[PDB]
Structures are given as structure tokens and as C-alpha cells.
Design a binder for this molecule. Structure first.
Ligand SMILES: O=C(N[C@@H]1CCC[C@H](Nc2nc(-c3c(CO)[nH]c4ncc(F)cc34)ncc2F)C1)N1CCCC1
Length: 163
């Protein structure tokens, strides 16, 4: 079962999941109804300018190792991964003036709306995601919320691999 999302081709390599419709609150306290995937799964993300290994559990990104053409290409893949993960901090990063998902049309997709929102500006997403101290894994680097490489700190779960 291969599928497309945010310009990437996803392929499940391990795990299984069941769907459950859930109501989540944004940072604006707005209710969104999302189709939540329950279960630990592993995927490959293949795009035109980036590729990744994604390890996720229910509404939680465990790890993402990204490889792409440059900073912008890698950032695009990170954004899709965070939205795909269905995490609460990704959902809570939706806040402020006019930052509302059009829900008067039930047939619309909140996942695509969240994607479009973070594609325009990932600064609140990347800042609100969290940062962790990383080990000295050679070949893989950490990446800070401004997409600066760091050998000591990175965005929680995120590693950059060389091409
Ligand atoms: O729910 C909607 N869009 C979704 C956007 C994300 C990908 C999703 N499609 C698909 N998602 C998945 C999927 C799996 C399968 O292992 N795990 C997931 N975990 C999180 C997630 F957001 C989607 C998944 N497996 C196969 C798919 F074709 C469709 N829509 C589109 C219009 C009607 C509602």
C-alpha cells in the first residue's frame, strides 16, 4: 500500500494501524476532526528533492532521518513528516490572527489544511516542536529550528543524513 502526501511518496516498511476519528484543539482552541492512525509504523518518504525514514507511533513521531538536495528541500520533508505524525504540538502550533481551518465544509481535509498552513510558515511549528541533546552519531547531524546544523542539539526526533 504505497500512497502520496505533500508531494512525497510514502511506503509502509513495518507495522500496522487502525483509524479513529478524533477531535483535537489547535493553539487557537479551535476544534478539528482528524482521522487518527493508531499503531507503531515505519515508512520511507520519497520526494523529488528529499528522502526520509520515518518512525511513528499514535500521534507521536519517534524518529525522522532526512536526506535532501539542500536546507529548503530538507525543511519541506520535515514539515510533511511533522504534519503526518498527527502530534499535539504540531496541532497546538496553529495559533493567532486568521489562523483558522475552514470547517463549514465537512468534506474538506484538515491534514491538507494543516500542511498548507505550515508550508507558508514553519517557524511556529519548528520552535514549538521541542529541542533535544543528541549523541555523537557520525554521518548524521542535528538540525536546530532555524535549519542550522548542530552536533550537540536538534529538533526532537530529527536527524539529517548526508546524500
Ligand atoms: O483523510 C484525508 N486525507 C489523508 C491525508 C494524509 C494521508 C492519508 N492517506 C493515507 N494514509 C495512510 C496512513 C497510514 C497507513 O499506514 N498511516 C498513517 N498515519 C498517519 C496518517 F496521517 C496517515 C496514515 N495510509 C494510506 C493512505 F492512503 C489521507 N482526507 C482526504 C479527503 C478526505 C479525507
Amino acid at each position: 500500500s504505497s500512497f502520496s502526501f505533500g508531494g512525497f511518496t510514502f511506503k509502509r516498511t513495518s507495522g500496522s494501524s487502525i483509524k479513529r476519528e478524533e477531535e483535537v484543539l489547535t493553539g487557537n482552541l479551535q476544534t478539528l476532526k482528524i482521522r487518527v492512525h493508531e499503531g507503531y509504523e515505519e515508512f520511507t518518504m520519497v520526494g523529488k528533492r528529499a528522502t526520509a525514514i520515518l518512525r511513528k507511533a499514535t500521534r507521536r513521531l519517534v524518529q525522522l532521518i532526512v536526506s535532501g538536495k539542500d536546507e529548503q528541500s530538507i525543511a519541506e520533508a520535515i514539515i510533511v513528516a511533522m504534519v503526518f505524525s498527527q502530534e499535539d504540538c504540531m496541532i497546538k502550533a496553529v495559533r493567532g490572527d486568521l489562523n483558522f481551518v475552514n470547517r463549514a465544509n465537512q468534506r474538506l481535509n484538515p491534514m491538507h489544511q494543516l500542511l498548507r498552513h505550515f508550508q507558508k510558515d514553519a517557524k511556529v511549528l519548528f520552535q514549538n516542536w521541542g529541542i533535544e541533546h543528541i549523541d555523537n552519531v557520525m554521518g548524521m547531524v542535528g538540525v536546530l529550528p532555524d535549519m542550522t546544523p548542530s552536533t550537540e542539539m536538534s529538533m526532537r526526533g530529527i536527524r539529517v543524513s548526508k546524500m
